[PDB]
Structure formats: structure tokens, C-alpha cells
Design a protein around this ligand. Structure first.
Ligand SMILES: *C(=O)[C@@H]([C@@H]1N=C(C(=O)O)[C@H]([C@H]2CCCO2)S1)[C@@H](C)O
Ligand SMILES: [Cl-]
Length: 247
């Protein structure tokens, strides 16, 4: 039988959003204490399109089915010129995730296919597990929905290698999730920006590795234009600093 004390609501963190003239939620989970904290318990449980944060489960499935052989395999540019310059080149899994290269992952989705994608998402217990829409864009404008607290749940399984895919697939995706590391912490995370369907939100989900603990985080925020995308990380780090998790 699972046990859970509940999410504590700390409305103090709301200052970090209002002082940036913004609206959103940050959710934190203390792995050692098995305690969760948020500034907004309702928005914490509100489900949105995952957008580019779907690259995490998408990468795991592609690797586990052999669609992606390893983190060095090159997915060559299809020659279509797109709005994001870094997309108009060849990529491997590391760089495709760092530059959030959508057309590489849509190709992953097509090769995975509807049937296996649905079955894997059910095995992951991922969000609402609904892939209705185009096989290669349902996480951008289809039926799939996931909340900040469901993101923590999924990430916790990935951290402990508990997802129903190979340990190796999971190690590879956690490698590709690497975002920042120094003498004080490691951050493995994925950004996201949902623009195709309202409301337009930005995501940042992942976790902070310390010497003797892991803090999982999931945040999203209203994002009416791309000028505020940097706030996804800045607001989260302000909360991490306030709680003395990072210096
Ligand atoms: C993912 O959600 C989107 C890609 N991710 C980002 C991001 O910042 O996380 C890119 C931003 C950068 C300029 C505008 O989009 S795109 C994907 C769904 O487009
Ligand atoms: Cl690593």
C-alpha cells in the first residue's frame, strides 16, 4: 500500500511569478523526505499539452524499440528549412533534445506508430494516456494532457529506472536530459512551449541532483509570447534558491 502525506501549498513562491508579471505554478518534490510542495495546488494538478516535454517519453520509447540505436546515431536533416535555425542540420539524440528538434521526434513518432505509442504511454501511466490526433503531433495539438504533479510521478520512475523499458534506454535519456552541472548540483530537465492550442504555456520539468538528495521539479506558466521563455528557468531557480536547494 502506497502512502503520501500530501502536497503542501506554499503561496510564498507566488512572489516569484508576480514580480515578473507572470502567472504559473512550480511543483517540487523532496525525494528523501517524500514531501511535495507547490505554490498553487489546483494549477499543480491541471493538465496541459506536454509539448516538447514529450521528448522525454518519446525518446525512451524510440530507444527501447530500436527506432534509435544509441545516442550517436545521426538523423539527417530532411532539407526542409524551418523557423528555428538549429533545426536545419543533422542531429543525434543529445543535440535533438538540447535544441528540441521537433521534426526528428515526429519521425520517431511515425516509426513508433499509433499502436505501440499508446501501449507504452499506458505502461508509463503517462498523463491521460490519450494519443488521439495525428500520430506525429498529438503531443502538440491532440488529446494528450499531463499536469505538473503527473510530470513528477513519471520523472520519479525514470530516475529510479522503474519505467517499463530497458535500464539502458532510461540511462540514455537521463544522459540526454543533462542541462547543467557544477560542483554544487546537476540538473536534468526538459523545456517545453505549447503554442498550437490555447492556453499558450511554457514548461520546465526535471530534477536537481545533490550529493545526498534529489529534488524533482515541474513548472508551467502562461506564456503569451516567446519573449518570456527565459522565465521558465529563472523563476524555477529563484524558488530553488529560496528553498536553499541550489546556492
Ligand atoms: C517544445 O515544446 C517546442 C520547442 N521547444 C522550445 C523550448 O524553448 O522549449 C523551442 C522554443 C524556442 C523558440 C520558440 O520555441 S521549440 C516545440 C513544441 O516547438
Ligand atoms: Cl550524464
Amino acid at each position: 500500500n502506497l502512502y503520501f502525506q500530501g502536497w503542501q501549498e506554499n503561496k510564498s513562491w507566488n512572489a516569484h511569478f508576480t514580480e515578473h508579471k507572470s502567472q504559473g505554478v512550480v511543483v517540487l518534490w523532496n525525494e528523501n523526505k517524500q514531501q511535495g510542495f507547490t505554490n498553487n495546488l489546483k494549477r499543480a494538478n491541471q493538465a496541459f499539452l506536454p509539448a516538447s516535454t514529450f521528448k522525454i517519453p518519446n525518446s525512451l520509447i524510440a530507444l527501447d524499440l530500436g527506432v534509435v540505436k544509441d545516442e550517436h546515431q545521426v538523423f539527417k536533416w530532411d532539407g526542409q528549412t524551418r523557423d528555428i535555425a538549429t533545426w536545419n542540420r543533422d542531429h543525434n539524440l543529445i543535440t535533438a533534445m538540447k535544441y528540441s528538434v521537433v521534426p526528428v521526434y515526429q519521425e520517431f513518432a511515425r516509426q513508433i506508430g499509433e499502436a505501440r505509442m499508446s501501449k507504452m504511454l499506458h505502461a508509463f501511466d503517462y498523463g491521460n494516456e490519450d494519443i488521439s490526433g495525428n500520430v506525429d503531433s498529438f503531443w502538440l495539438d491532440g488529446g494528450i494532457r499531463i499536469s505538473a504533479t503527473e510530470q513528477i510521478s513519471f520523472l520519479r520512475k525514470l530516475y529510479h529506472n522503474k519505467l517499463h523499458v530497458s535500464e539502458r534506454s532510461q540511462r540514455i535519456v537521463k544522459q540526454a536530459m543533462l542541462t547543467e552541472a557544477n560542483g554544487d548540483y546537476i540538473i536534468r530537465a526538459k523545456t517545453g512551449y505549447s503554442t498550437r492550442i490555447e492556453p499558450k504555456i511554457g514548461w520546465w520539468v526535471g530534477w536537481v541532483e545533490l550529493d545526498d538528495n534529489v529534488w524533482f521539479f515541474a513548472m508551467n506558466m502562461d506564456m503569451p509570447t516567446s519573449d518570456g521563455l527565459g522565465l521558465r528557468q529563472a523563476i524555477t531557480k529563484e524558488v530553488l534558491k529560496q528553498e536553499k536547494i541550489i546556492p
